[PDB]
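Run: sequence + sodium ion -> complex structure.
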Amino acid sequence: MFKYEEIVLERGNSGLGFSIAGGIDNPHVPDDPGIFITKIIPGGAAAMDGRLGVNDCVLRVNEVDVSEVVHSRAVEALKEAGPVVRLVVRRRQPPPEETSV
Ligand code: NA
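>> structure
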């Protein structure tokens, strides 16, 4: 399935230091409405924190669910989330060594 992670960033003078694509009206890939990271800015908060990666999917911004929203609503959430932004993200979970069935 997926690996989930909570990542907390402090906003800087140039924001959070990443770009997003995706949204119900802006799919990154077919039939996926998710918000995905497309760019991490050198010297920005995301880069300096080290945890976020390109093509991570952002599911939540503080208390705002962004799993299935229009692009502008995700941008809005990220803009208005305040000085400390808690991101719930997911990415690929590598196959396990074994699975109990
Ligand atoms: Na929406």
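>> summary
Residues 69-70, 73 surround sodium ion (CB under 6 Å). The domain at 1-101 is CATH 2.30.42.10 (Pdz3 Domain).
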